[PDB]
Ligand binder design. Structure first.
Ligand SMILES: CN1C(=O)[C@]2(CC(C)(C)Cc3ccc(-c4cncnc4)cc32)N=C1N
Ligand code: NI
Length: 402
């Protein structure tokens, strides 16, 4: 349970994703690649772009092979598109292996790259079912496991930022670890608790209960997972279904009522500040998500602090103060346990055993009174089915799966 070479191999800027160094081609071309458990394509910038100072140059690689097939990926925010191919890929601060993987060479995009994020591509770590153009395009991790002796598991320790912040001109730097093929015991303390992967597409899980400062939200538990709940390193926020979001905001507002913030703050569109070092952490409640256990009728809870859901943003004009963005937001596509959740925990994506593990992170931000926690078991007599069944569209139904 030691993977020293892979420790601290993640970097990034607060709110702009965590990236790992990868190489593509022969000889190896280094790129910084966003670690994304909410998508399934390995897609890299492969043409000039205003926000890229470098890109994958297919012509420089002796081992590049064109698949003679394009790929077009629209999404809520924007789109990326390009040409499919294969090449040799390695992770310099990962396993000592080289694999031939599918690579989508991005030739055109809109609102994909982020000015100053310092990453040039995305490593989709989710399953084939959500790959583009379709599930026949083998994802990177599938190729890694098939071609090498790497165990079918990876783990993420995402370490967030905190005041005092170093710089007033740039965003806060973040760090973390992606351990490929194993669990590094130095990255967590206490017990490691597992929740089943409900279905292998996203890393989908089931939330059975939600508490805000130990107060149950008392909703039909299907509401917590409407229309899914997923663990996504490629989302910054904790994102909650509309009804759940509204209930949570009401509870957090009530707990923090000594302070009256503008509506903009609760919408994530405005910062609130306190004089350096005086942030009243204790007026903001803890949030507990109970996840279905491996055993029927069991659950465990992960508990996060305001140090996780209030994101530090240093303002140029207000550099004397500690300022924060509310990082819980409304979803219409289910619960997303993003960086806000993941920064509290060491998270084990145990694909081999179709389960996700959580343990208290050795790097999580906390104070002397409260800590992020992972606690269980909680037993429920005749526990209900909290899973939602997404209505089946005709187009989805028409798909053949040979
Ligand atoms: C929710 N989600 C996305 O919208 C997506 C979809 C994708 C098509 C891969 C394009 C993309 C680009 C940047 C970020 C990003 C991530 N973190 C910070 N800033 C931007 C996230 C994503 N991947 C995920 N998981
Ligand atoms: Ni058929």
């Amino acid at each position: 349970g030691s993977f020293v070479e892979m420790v601290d191999n993640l970097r990034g800027k607060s709110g702009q994703g965590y990236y790992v160094e990868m190489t593509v081609g022969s000889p190896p071309q280094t790129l910084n690649i966003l670690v994304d458990t909410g998508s399934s394509n390995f897609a890299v910038g492969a043409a000039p772009h205003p926000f890229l100072h470098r890109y994958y140059q297919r012509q420089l690689s002796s081992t590049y092979r064109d698949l003679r097939k394009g790929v077009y990926v629209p999404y809520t925010q924007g789109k990326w598109e390009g040409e499919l191919g294969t090449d040799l890929v390695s992770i310099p601060h990962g396993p000592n292996v080289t694999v031939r993987a599918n690579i989508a060479a991005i030739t055109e995009s809109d609102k994909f790259f982020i000015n100053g994020s310092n990453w040039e591509g995305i490593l989709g770590l989710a399953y084939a079912e959500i790959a583009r153009p379709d599930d026949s395009l083998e994802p990177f991790f599938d190729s890694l496991v098939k071609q090498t002796h790497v165990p079918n598991l990876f783990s993420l320790q995402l370490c967030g930022a905190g005041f005092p912040l170093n710089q007033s001109e740039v965003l806060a730097s973040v760090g973390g670890s992606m351990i490929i093929g194993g669990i590094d015991h130095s990255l967590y303390t206490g017990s490691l608790w597992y929740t089943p992967i409900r279905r292998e597409w996203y890393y989908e899980v089931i939330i059975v209960r939600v508490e805000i400062n130990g107060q149950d939200l008392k909703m039909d538990c299907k509401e917590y997972n409407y229309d899914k709940s997923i663990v996504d390193s490629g989302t910054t926020n904790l994102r909650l279904p509309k009804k759940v979001f509204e209930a949570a905001v009401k509870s957090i507002k009530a707990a923090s009522s000594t302070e009256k913030f503008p509506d903009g703050f609760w919408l994530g569109e405005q910062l609130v500040c306190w004089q350096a070092g005086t942030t009243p952490w204790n007026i903001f409640p803890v949030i507990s998500l109970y996840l279905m256990g491996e055993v029927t009728n069991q659950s465990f809870r992960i508990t996060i602090l305001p140090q996780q859901y209030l994101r530090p943003v240093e303002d140029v004009a207000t550099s004397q103060d500690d300022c924060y963005k509310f990082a819980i937001s409304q979803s219409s596509t289910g619960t997303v346990m993003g960086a806000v959740i993941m920064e509290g925990f060491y998270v084990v994506f145990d694909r081999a055993r179709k389960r996700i593990g959580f343990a208290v992170s050795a790097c999580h931000v906390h104070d002397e009174f409260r800590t992020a926690a992972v606690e269980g078991p909680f037993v429920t007599l005749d526990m209900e089915d909290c899973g939602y069944n997404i209505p089946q569209t005709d187009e989805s139904r028409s798909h053949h799966h040979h």
